[PDB]
Design a protein around this ligand. Structure first.
Ligand SMILES: CCCCCCCCCCCCCCCCCC(=O)OC[C@H](COP(=O)(O)OCCN)OC(=O)CCCCCCCCCCCCCCCCC
Ligand SMILES: CCCCCCCCCCCCCCCCCC(=O)OC[C@H](COP(=O)(O)OCCN)OC(=O)CCCCCCCCCCCCCCCCC
Ligand code: SF4
Ligand code: SF4
Lengths: 73, 160, 66, 68, 97, 117, 315, 186, 167
């Protein structure tokens, strides 16, 4: 019989699965999205600046409603 | 890999071994003197202790010595049993050597797989003599005792 | 002789060597194929490239699909 | 997968006496097997044999319960 | 690899579309901030031996440049009247302050 | 980066705290003259035992450095390959590796690792 | 917002640290069980329920066991190396790839080379602190093994690096989006197993700690708490290489359980070697390092460099 | 098969006379074996396979054994079916005992019977050889089958007659079984 | 703050360096110095590429020689002095509080990290090492790399000529 080994491997693979799902859950709950905007590139960083400056929370994205409601002319 | 006993005083340069002085004698148990003080029958197990990996072959050596002095001969059935167990010990010893050697090099799996089968053979020694190792089964007038019935067959499957 | 001798002694090196010769040949094929299309008026340009009309680069811009 | 093996598990686990009476047996003996009551000892022990297993496993003992 | 090149180029093509809008909203703040930055350089050295805004006590920092040549101030100068909180907010963004 | 720096400092502090904690959790024993000797299979250690430094291990590590630096030279090929001129990048890189092989194969015929000692 | 970013980054690092530590400590059982069945043994099934709490049991023993510190004044220097080794074996994890941003860590391959390099200093000073010729030979043999293999390790990396077109590890996922990458670079996988196995000092390349040749190599003069840290450090190392094998060759599918199935299988494969192979000699390994692997890696470098040139030609 | 390299007569088998061919199929075979570690793959798959064999560990102390009726273990001084001591102090057991682990002092009990006063065995000198029981003329002393007699103190091992008699009483049933099995055969 | 703290740590270790005389203690001191200098140059650079590089060459491989041949050990281990440590801690702290005091900006370098470049710069939106390491391979400044590799080849010819004195 070989189920004998399954307890271990099942436990290890479980523990190593945790952290990502921990990261996902903590993100989608405690930010508003599951993914934190990656900032490897200059353009990503400046866009991050642009977002972070428009509102304190980049992840609290501003939809198209942020456009001025109208121009009289 | 030093048998637990051996003590090599080595002088090395780099990693190579230049002078290798082995100090045999970390085990010496004054067995020549003790053998002298006791009787031939009493002296018999001493030989089984010596080269303890070879159980029966050691005894057969001593028993042949006495038989040559006493000018005696054993019956065929005793000869065949001696021959049988001489070779069973041969398989035991060579497993021991191979298994120890495999660990010397660092392979565990061979040693364990063979030491499974070493258990079956020792059980056979246990069946005939009553001791796992260190039987007293070979004696000057032939083997100490007859064999239990069916031990022939069990030997057959084990060899099988 | 030497042929089987090496292929019997150092098989990994013989196999590796044949790999290296393969790579360089196709590498030269790569360079040749590269300059068949002139390889320098590359289809997609890093940054924001702009040309005034009639600029010799502008005259050269590929009008192809990709 | 479970080629009439989960069935055998059901036999030993259920007729043991439930989750508790399978776990405590397992917890104590570090294995759970099926045999027949060869004979009840004078001192509360219970002996079980089953030729299905091999000589190492052929015969075995469940010590007296009061020995925790 | 064709698929990898496919999407990367799409990023770069979407990339170029966006960029001018950032530059446009960038220029206004640069000129706005420079106006203010010169104002303070004027208003802080009111009582200084010979201070001359945009120069070092007379002679211009740059001369070969024709007149009405705008030279972007070095980052430190651009932040010459700023706190660390402002300074780090842009400088230490690779490092994620 | 400093996000990395702080995390490493935090880990190292937690690491030393754990080992510091185990140092108090483990029971003490009155010291012994012999309990604190070098282990030599149970027979008295010889004189100082400081190994000779007449050996080759520096020589191997020197081969390491040469190849370790050469590795440094060839690391950036990954990125520049998209930008650099292709002839120069092609030939220049190819002769790097080619010279390495020839150095290696010439050196096998030398066989320098099969030292007499 | 911004401080949301930082708080999570620290939570993830901390959360990963406890998991990787508890995993490797708990993984030790899987070695003991699995090796127990390679050999015809039954392996630990005694403590708890089927030997599950066996590794916790082990830690309790060690931390209770005293610290038989070596000669009088070595206290610190002997107490340093275990810290400075377990630190590397853990902190090396932070570069591992996620789609869920833990870091924007670029140059991840370089960082891999660096951390895998720093193991030499830990083992060497550890032996030096011990001050016992047995421990000292182990360190030197350990140092030579690691240092020799790094040479091949670097060039092997570059083949993958070229094949992905950047040093950012994450691109391994994009390039494996259709078909796994082992089936392209099969020989590299065998070589990479050997390189990884050499780094973590497991057998067949078991010279550093070893047995039956050196008593425990550098480890011989280590008391409990130090020994536990070294022993945990090695297993954090064996897991990480198993992860790196998985992310390179076998899909890099971080957000798919099958990736974690692959982690266990590879770490199992390491054991599967442990109970099968015998050990090498010193010199034969150095032949295998320089005269065999370096040649191998250079050929593929010269092979794939041309291939990507041809690939660039086509597009 | 390749030819030999040394011609062999009977009564021997050379284990290396087989030649390593130079045929191209033969070299390429070996080369492919080294380039892709076929031999390692064979051994690798063996150990995978051999997971699927059931381990042979006895679940000691629950499962246990096997031994044989002749097993030489704990010593015991038997008693007649009436309950009388079998030993008569013939002192052969001491005279033969290779380790000289037996000490005996005998006198006359008030009934006038030849019986022991002190009968001592040191199972830190005994070798469990069984020469004592093979010599005893009335089967007074026997290598009982118990073997889990482990003590925390060395003094506890030196048995005297009282301890030995107790073991005989404790183990009498099993010893009776073995002797019924082996007396006519021993 | 990180930059000037890193100056402070380098200063303190430098004072450690000039005191220590045991070769391991010195070689240990170099090890710390190298991490610190790698950190520092990284901060003022466009990226940490060069920092990773010189780390693995200088420290990772080449300080192995220094420690290894300086494994002379003095024949005995350290007699560590908690006093120079305490002074090291003491000198570090009030340097550190001064670092908290010192002018936030003016006490910083002026070099232009990738972030501290202007947004308009169209060149800055490439791979961080692409444009820096370009002319190490593109003509006519690439032959010098060929000189480097042959220099290293010749270096090995030299080492086997010096390290081969009759043994
Ligand atoms: C917590 C686990 C402690 C393990 C380490 C240990 O054994 O400490 C033992 C010590 C008392 O043990 P003991 O040596 O028997 O008595 C003092 C002798 N002078 O423990 C103590 O003295 C303190 C225990 C506090 C509760
Ligand atoms: C809120 C928290 C509330 C706490 C609830 C209690 C938590 C502890 C539950 C486990 C306690 C076990 C008590 C019963 C016991 O003694 O079991 C012993 C068990 C088996 O040990 P053994 O004697 O060798 O038998 C092996 C049989 N195959 O071996 C053991 O289980 C002993 C080792 C247990 C390890 C846990 C240590 C206690 C603290 C929890 C860890 C934090
Ligand atoms: S041989 Fe038997 S009867 Fe004689 S003294 Fe010994 S135990 Fe008693
Ligand atoms: S078994 Fe042998 S050694 Fe032991 S008491 Fe009997 S005769 Fe003596």
């Amino acid at each position: 019989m070989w189920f004998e080994i399954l307890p271990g491997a099942v436990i290890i693979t479980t523990l190593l699965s945790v952290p990502i799902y921990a990261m996902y859950g903590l993100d989608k709950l405690m930010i508003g999205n599951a993914f934190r905007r990656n900032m490897d590139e200059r353009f990503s960083r400046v866009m991050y600046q642009r977002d972070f400056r428009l509102t304190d929370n980049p992840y609290k994205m501003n939809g198209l409603d942020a456009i001025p409601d109208e121009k009289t002319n | 890999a030093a048998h637990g006993v051996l003590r090599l005083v080595l002088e090395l340069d780099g990693e190579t071994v230049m002078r290798a002085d082995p100090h045999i004698g970390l085990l010496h148990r004054g067995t020549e003197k003790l053998i002298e003080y006791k009787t031939y029958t009493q002296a018999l197990p001493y030989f089984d202790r010596l080269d303890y990996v070879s159980m029966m072959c050691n005894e057969q050596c001593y028993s042949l010595a006495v038989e040559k002095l006493l000018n005696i001969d054993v019956p065929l059935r005793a000869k065949y049993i001696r021959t049988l167990f001489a070779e069973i010990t041969r398989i035991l010893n060579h497993i021991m050597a191979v298994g120890t050697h495999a660990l010397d090099v660092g392979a565990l799996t061979p040693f364990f797989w063979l030491f499974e089968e070493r258990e079956k053979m020792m059980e056979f020694y246990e069946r005939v003599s009553g001791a796992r190792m260190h039987a007293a089964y070979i004696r000057p007038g032939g083997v100490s005792l007859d064999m239990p019935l069916g031990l022939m067959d069990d030997i057959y499957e084990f060899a099988s | 002789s030497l042929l089987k001798r090496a292929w019997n002694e150092i098989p990994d090196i013989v196999g590796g060597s044949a790999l290296a010769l393969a790579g360089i040949v196709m590498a030269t094929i790569g360079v040749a194929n590269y300059y068949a299309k002139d390889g320098d008026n590359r289809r997609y340009k890093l940054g924001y490239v702009v040309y005034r009309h009639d600029d010799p680069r502008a005259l050269k811009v590929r009008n192809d699909e990709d | 997968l479970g080629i009439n093996r989960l069935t055998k598990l059901f036999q030993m686990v259920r007729e043991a006496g439930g989750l508790k009476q399978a776990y405590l047996k397992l917890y104590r003996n570090d294995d759970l097997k099926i045999g027949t009551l060869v004979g009840i000892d004078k001192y509360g022990n219970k002996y079980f044999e089953n030729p299905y297993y091999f000589y190492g496993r052929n015969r075995w003992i469940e010590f007296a319960p009061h020995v925790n | 690899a064709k698929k990898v090149k496919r999407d990367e180029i799409e990023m770069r093509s979407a990339q170029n579309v966006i960029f001018p809008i950032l530059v446009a909203e960038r220029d206004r703040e640069f000129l706005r901030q420079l106006r203010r930055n010169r104002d303070e350089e004027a208003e802080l050295m009111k009582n200084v031996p010979g201070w001359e805004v945009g120069t070092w006590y007379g002679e211009p920092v740059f001369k070969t440049l024709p007149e009405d040549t705008l030279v972007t101030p070095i980052f430190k100068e651009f932040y010459a009247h700023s706190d660390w909180k402002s300074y780090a907010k842009r400088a230490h963004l690779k490092l994620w302050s | 980066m400093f996000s990395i720096i702080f995390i490493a400092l935090l880990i190292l502090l937690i690491t030393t705290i754990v080992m510091f904690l185990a140092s108090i959790l483990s029971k003490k024993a009155l010291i012994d003259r012999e309990k604190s000797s070098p282990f030599e299979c149970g027979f008295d250690p010889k004189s100082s035992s400081r190994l000779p430094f007449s050996l080759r291990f520096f020589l191997i590590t020197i081969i390491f450095l040469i190849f370790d630096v050469e590795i440094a030279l060839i690391l950036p090929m990954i990125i520049i390959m998209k930008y650099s001129n292709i002839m120069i990048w092609t030939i220049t890189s190819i002769i790097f590796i080619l010279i390495l092989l020839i150095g290696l194969y010439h050196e096998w015929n030398q066989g320098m690792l099969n030292w007499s000692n | 917002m911004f401080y949301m970013e930082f708080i999570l980054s620290l939570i993830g690092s901390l959360l990963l640290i406890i998991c990787v530590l508890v995993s490797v400590a708990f993984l030790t059982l899987l070695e003991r069980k699995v090796l127990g069945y390679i050999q015809i043994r039954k392996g630990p099934n005694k403590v708890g329920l089927m030997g599950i709490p066996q590794p916790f049991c082990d830690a309790i023993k060690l931390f209770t066991k005293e610290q038989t510190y070596p000669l009088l004044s070595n206290y610190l220097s002997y107490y340093i190396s275990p810290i400075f080794s377990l630190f590397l074996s853990l902190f090396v994890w932070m570069c591992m790839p996620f789609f869920v941003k833990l870091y924007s860590f670029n140059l991840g391959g370089l960082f891999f080379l660096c951390c895998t390099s720093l193991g030499v200093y830990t083992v060497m000073v550890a032996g030096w602190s011990s001050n016992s010729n047995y421990a000292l030979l182990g360190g030197l043999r350990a140092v030579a093994q690691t240092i020799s293999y790094e040479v091949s390790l670097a060039l092997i990396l570059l083949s993958f690096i070229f094949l992905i077109g950047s040093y950012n590890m994450i691109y391994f996922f994009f390039y494996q989006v259709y078909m796994w990458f082992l089936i392209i670079l099969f020989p590299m996988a065998l070589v990479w197993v050997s390189i990884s196995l050499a780094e973590t000092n497991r057998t067949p390349f078991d010279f550093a700690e070893g047995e039956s040749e050196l008593v425990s190599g550098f480890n011989v003069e280590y008391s409990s708490g130090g020994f536990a840290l070294i022993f945990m450090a090695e297993y954090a190392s064996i897991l990480f290489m198993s992860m790196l094998f998985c992310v390179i060759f076998l899909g890099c599918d971080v957000f798919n359980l099958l990736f974690y199935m692959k982690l266990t299988f590879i770490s199992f494969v390491f054991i599967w070697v442990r109970g099968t192979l015998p050990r090498f000699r010193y010199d034969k390994l150095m032949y295998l390092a320089w005269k065999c692997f370096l040649s191998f890696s250079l050929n593929y470098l010269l092979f794939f460099i041309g291939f990507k040139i041809l690939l660039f030609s086509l597009l | 098969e390749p030819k030999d390299i040394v011609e062999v007569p009977k009564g021997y088998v050379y284990v290396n006379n087989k030649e390593l061919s130079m045929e191209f199929a033969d070299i390429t075979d070996r080369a492919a074996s080294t380039m892709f570690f076929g031999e390692l793959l064979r051994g690798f798959a063996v150990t995978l396979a051999h997971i699927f064999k059931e381990p042979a560990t006895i679940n000691y102390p629950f499962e246990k054994g096997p031994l044989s009726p002749r097993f030489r273990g704990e010593h015991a001084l038997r008693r007649y079916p009436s309950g009388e001591e079998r030993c008569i102090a013939c002192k052969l057991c001491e005279a033969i005992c290779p380790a000289q682990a037996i000490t005996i002092e005998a006198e006359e009990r008030a009934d006038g019977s030849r019986r022991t006063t002190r009968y001592d065995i040191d199972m830190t000198k005994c070798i469990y050889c069984g020469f004592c029981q093979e010599a005893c003329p009335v089967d007074a002393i026997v290598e009982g089958p118990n073997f889990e007699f482990s003590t925390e103190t060395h003094e506890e091992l030196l048995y005297n007659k009282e301890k030995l008699l107790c073991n005989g009483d404790k183990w009498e049933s099993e010893i009776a079984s073995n002797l019924q099995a082996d007396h006519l055969y021993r | 703050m990180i930059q000037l703290m890193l100056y402070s740590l380098i200063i303190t270790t430098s004072i450690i360096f000039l005191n220590m005389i045991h070769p391991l203690a010195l070689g240990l001191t170099l090890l710390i110095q190298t991490i610190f200098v790698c950190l520092l140059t990284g901060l003022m650079t466009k990226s940490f590429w060069y920092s990773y590089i010189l780390f693995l060459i200088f420290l990772g491989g080449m300080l192995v020689l220094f420690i290894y041949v300086t494994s002379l050990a003095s024949n005995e281990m350290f007699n560590l002095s908690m006093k120079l440590t305490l002074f090291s801690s003491l000198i570090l702290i009030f340097m550190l509080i001064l670092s908290f005091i010192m002018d936030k900006t003016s006490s910083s370098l002026f070099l232009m990290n990738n972030d501290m470049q202007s947004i308009i710069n169209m060149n800055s939106y490439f791979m961080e090492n692409s444009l820096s390491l370009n002319k190490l391979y593109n003509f006519p400044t690439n032959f010098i790399t060929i000189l480097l590799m042959n220099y290293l080849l010749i270096t090995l010819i030299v080492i086997v000529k010096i390290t081969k004195l009759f043994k």
